[PDB]
Paper text:
The native structure of [name] was refined to 2.2-Å resolution. Like other CD-NTases, the [name] protein folds into two distinct domains. The longest strand, βE in the middle, extends into a flanking β-sheet with strand βB’ on one side and βF and βG on the other. The helical domain consisted of six major helices, including the first helix, α1. The separation of helices α1 and α2, which correspond to the “spine” in [name] by a short loop in [name], may account for its constitutive [name] activity as a type II enzyme. [name] was most similar to EfCdnE, with 44% identity. Despite the differences in local regions, the dispositions of the [name] and helical domains were similar in the native structures of [name], EfCdnE, and LpCdnE, respectively.
CD-NTases share an N-terminal core domain with templated and non-templated polymerases of the nucleotidyltransferase ([name]) superfamily, but the C-terminal helical domain shows a higher degree of variation. Three conserved acidic residues in the central β-sheet of the [name] domain coordinate with two metal ions (A and B) that are essential for catalysis. Based on sequence conservation and structural similarity, it is proposed that the cyclic di-pyrimidine-synthesizing CdnE proteins, including [name], EfCdnE, and LpCdnE, form smaller donor pockets that act as molecular gauges to recognize and retain the binding of pyrimidine nucleotides but weaken or exclude the binding to purine nucleotides.
Residue numbers in the entry: 2 to 298
Write the structure that this text describes.
C-alpha cells in the first residue's frame, strides 16, 4: 500500500480543531451584515452554512466557507404537469432575485468595505483576514418542488450571473449526512474526508485527475457506499479498499447506478445537468486504485 494505516487514519480527521468556530463566525458576520442593512433587515432572511463546513467534511485548512442567505418572503415552485399553477395560488412581486443579489452585495460592502467583497458568478466573496476565513455568500430564494401526491420538498433556488437557475437542498443534505454518520459510528464522514483528501493529494503530486471529479461528487459517492462497507471492516485501509471496489463495480455499467442520488436524495447524480458521467467516476476509481498500490496476488 502506498500509505500506511496511520497515514490514512490521520487523513480521516478534520483539518483543525476549530472548524465549528470558523463556521459560526462566518455565519454571524454575514447575519450581521444583513441585519445592519436598512433594506434587507425588513425581509425574512435566514443565514445558514451549507457546504463542507456545515457538513463537517472539509479537509483543507481555511478553505472557503459556504454561507447561504435565503430569502423567503416569496418562494419559487414547480408543480407536476397535471396540476395548475393558477389553482395552486399565484403570487406576483416586484422584487426579484437579481435585485436581491445586488442588495446582498451592498450589505456586504457596507460591513466589510468594497475592497474586501468580490462579486462572482455564483456567490459574493468576503476576503479572509487574520480573524475570518474566506467566505462565499450565496443569496438564494425559498423553493418548493411538489410531487404527485400533494407533498412538497423545500429547498433553495438562485440564478448565476450568466443566467443559469440552480436548485439545491442543503438542509436535507446536512440532515441525511448526519443520519448516515449516526448509523456508521461516525465512519461515513471520516471516509468522506479520507476520499476528499486522497483526491487533493493525487492532484498535488501531478496525478491525472479529471476536472469533472469534484469534492462534492466524492461526498455523494461515499454517501452511496452501503453502511456495511463502513461497519463490517476493521481498518481504514480495508474500508477504503472496499469502498473503491464497490464504486468501481457499480459504475462499470450505467444501469447499476442511474438511480443514485446526491446526499439530499432529492436530485440524481447521473440524470443530466452534471459535469461528470458515471464513466468519469469509474475511471477515477481506477486511477485511485492504481495510485494506492494495494498488494495483489
Amino acid at each position: 500500500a502506498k500509505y500506511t494505516e496511520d497515514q490514512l487514519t490521520s487523513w480521516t480527521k478534520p483539518p483543525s480543531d476549530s472548524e465549528q468556530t470558523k463556521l459560526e463566525n462566518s455565519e454571524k458576520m454575514v447575519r450581521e451584515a444583513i441585519s445592519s442593512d436598512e433594506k434587507l433587515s425588513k425581509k425574512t432572511i435566514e443565514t445558514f452554512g451549507q457546504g463542507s463546513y456545515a457538513n463537517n467534511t472539509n479537509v483543507r485548512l481555511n478553505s472557503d466557507i459556504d454561507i447561504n442567505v435565503k430569502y423567503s418572503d416569496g418562494f419559487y415552485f414547480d408543480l407536476p404537469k397535471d396540476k395548475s399553477r393558477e389553482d395552486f395560488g399565484i403570487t406576483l412581486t416586484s422584487y426579484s432575485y437579481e435585485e436581491y443579489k445586488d442588495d446582498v452585495e451592498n450589505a456586504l460592502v457596507n460591513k466589510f468595505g468594497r475592497s474586501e467583497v468580490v462579486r462572482k458568478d455564483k456567490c459574493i466573496t468576503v476576503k479572509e483576514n487574520s480573524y475570518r476565513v474566506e467566505t462565499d455568500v450565496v443569496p438564494t430564494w425559498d423553493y418548493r418542488r411538489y410531487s404527485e401526491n400533494g407533498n412538497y420538498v423545500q429547498g433553495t433556488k438562485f440564478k448565476t450571473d450568466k443566467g443559469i437557475w440552480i436548485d439545491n437542498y442543503p438542509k436535507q443534505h446536512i440532515a441525511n449526512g448526519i443520519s448516515k454518520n449516526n448509523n456508521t459510528a461516525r465512519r461515513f464522514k471520516r471516509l468522506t474526508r479520507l476520499h476528499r483528501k486522497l483526491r487533493y493529494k493525487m492532484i498535488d503530486d501531478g496525478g491525472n485527475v479529471s476536472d469533472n471529479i469534484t469534492s462534492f461528487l466524492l461526498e455523494c459517492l461515499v454517501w452511496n457506499v452501503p453502511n456495511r462497507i463502513m461497519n463490517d471492516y476493521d481498518t481504514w485501509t480495508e474500508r477504503l479498499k472496499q469502498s473503491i471496489i464497490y464504486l468501481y463495480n457499480n459504475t462499470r455499467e450505467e444501469s447499476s447506478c442511474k438511480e443514485w442520488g446526491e446526499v439530499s436524495e432529492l436530485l440524481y447524480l447521473f440524470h443530466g445537468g452534471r459535469k461528470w458521467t458515471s464513466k468519469d467516476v469509474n475511471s477515477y476509481m481506477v486511477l485511485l486504485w492504481n495510485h494506492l498500490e494495494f498488494l495483489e496476488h
